[PDB]
Amino acid sequence: PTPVEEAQQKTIEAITKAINYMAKRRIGALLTIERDTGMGDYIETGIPLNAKVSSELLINIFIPNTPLHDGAVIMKNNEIAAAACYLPLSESPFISKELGTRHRAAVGISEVTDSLTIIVSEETGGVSVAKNGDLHRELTEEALKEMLEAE
Amino acid sequence: PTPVEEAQQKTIEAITKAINYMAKRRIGALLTIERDTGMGDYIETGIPLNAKVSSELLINIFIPNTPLHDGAVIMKNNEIAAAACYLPLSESPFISKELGTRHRAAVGISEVTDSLTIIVSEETGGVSVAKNGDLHRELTEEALKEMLEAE
Numbered sequence: 001p002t003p004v005e006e007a008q009q010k011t012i013e014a015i016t017k018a019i020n021y022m023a024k025r026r027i028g029a030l031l032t033i034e035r036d037t038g039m040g041d042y043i044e045t046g047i048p049l050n051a052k053v054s055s056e057l058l059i060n061i062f063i064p065n066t067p068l069h070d071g072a073v074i075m076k077n078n079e080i081a082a083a084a085c086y087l088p089l090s091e092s093p094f095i096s097k098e099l100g101t102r103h104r105a106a107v108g109i110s111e112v113t114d115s116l117t118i119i120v121s122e123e124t125g126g127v128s129v130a131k132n133g134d135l136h137r138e139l140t141e142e143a144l145k146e147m148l149e150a151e
Numbered sequence: 152p153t154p155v156e157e158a159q160q161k162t163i164e165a166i167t168k169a170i171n172y173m174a175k176r177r178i179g180a181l182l183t184i185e186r187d188t189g190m191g192d193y194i195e196t197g198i199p200l201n202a203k204v205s206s207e208l209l210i211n212i213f214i215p216n217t218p219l220h221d222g223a224v225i226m227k228n229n230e231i232a233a234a235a236c237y238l239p240l241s242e243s244p245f246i247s248k249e250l251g252t253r254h255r256a257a258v259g260i261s262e263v264t265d266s267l268t269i270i271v272s273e274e275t276g277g278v279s280v281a282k283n284g285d286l287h288r289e290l291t292e293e294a295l296k297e298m299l300e301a302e
């Protein structure tokens with residue numbers, strides 16, 4: 001595997017471990033992975049980290065009632081660029097009515113970028129992904145990992 | 152002020168804001184600032200971050216019962232190098248006997264480096280600094296700022 005490919009695999013393992021930990025504990029989370037559409041305008045709204053990825057840091061960011069937990073984490077390649085970032089709210093009618101602002105923000109950024117956003121529901125622990133204006137809910141651990149590997 | 156001086160002051164303000172919040176909430180914390188003696192061997196025991204300093208990230212790191220809260224944060228070159236790092240425990244018989252391992256770790260690293268370590272007590276919220284093998288206890292906010300500026 002090339003170093004780039006190994007680094008990607010490590011980042012995916014770190015994300016999936018953090019998401020699984022948060023889902024089990026009903027820690028709401030909103031994590032956008034920048035792809036080819038640059039997200040600088042949204043990164044600049046948050047608190048800069050420019051930090052190496054780890055499952056530990058991802059989990060620490062989203063702990064309820066802490067400075068960094070409200071808003072989106074935006075990742076650039078193998079780094080956490082910023083936390084507590086603004087994303088635009090979607091008005092799509094295909095967002096389940098019971099869902100709150102994290103899911104609407106995720107679909108919103110997915111309408112104007114090619115990013116992949118993962119959401120953990122604080123109500124149910126369900127994991128969802130927003131991409132290209134669509135929300136895919138109730139993902140298994142295996143499905144999330146496959147989606148990330150394909151991305 | 153020059154860019155380097157403005158950056159140093161921003162970091163001092165971020166540190167003091169985090170320490171003040173943790174003192175108020177009696178959140179135990181251990182934060183070592185590397186100086187001329189390299190601390191790479193201790194940095195390598197922790198979770199790599201290489202993150203920009205912010206008061207928000209410092210607070211999020213030390214929240215109890217989280218992945219990153221157990222061990223020292225080590226700062227280097229105006230960044231958070233790593234969290235959850237090992238520091239050596241002092242065997243000094245001249246540390247106040249009611250203090251536990253966080254304070255002994257701070258004194259211990261200060262015995263073998265020129266670093267400055269800040270400790271927040273989880274028992275009292277008291278703020279102390281270890282340097283040169285001595286622990287300076289029960290600091291006011293002004294006293295901590297003076298130490299950081301002198302350092």
Ligand SMILES: Nc1cc(-c2ccccc2)no1
Pocket residue numbers: 064065066176177178214215
């Ligand atoms: N801001 C914040 C503080 C805490 C906490 C929890 C247990 C013990 C001490 C502090 N959790 O979130």
Ligand SMILES: [Mg+2]
Pocket residue numbers: 137138
């Ligand atoms: Mg389904």
